[PDB]
Design a protein around this ligand. Structure first.
Ligand SMILES: [Cu+2]
Ligand SMILES: [Cu+2]
Lengths: 29, 29
């Protein structure tokens, strides 16, 4: 359980970071 | 444990959505 859930957490954080970087890109141009 | 972790999951998803909407905004203008 927790294992996969923690994975689901980790994965989600990785999505977040990506988006944030994207915005920075869009913000810088 | 799992409770708060699930919360940490829920919260994170809510961050994601926000970002996505933001990008859409920036994309539409
Ligand atoms: Cu890894
Ligand atoms: Cu609620």
């Amino acid at each position: 359980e927790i294992a996969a859930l923690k994975x689901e957490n980790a994965a989600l954080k990785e999505e977040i970071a990506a988006l944030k970087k994207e915005i920075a890109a869009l913000x810088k141009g």
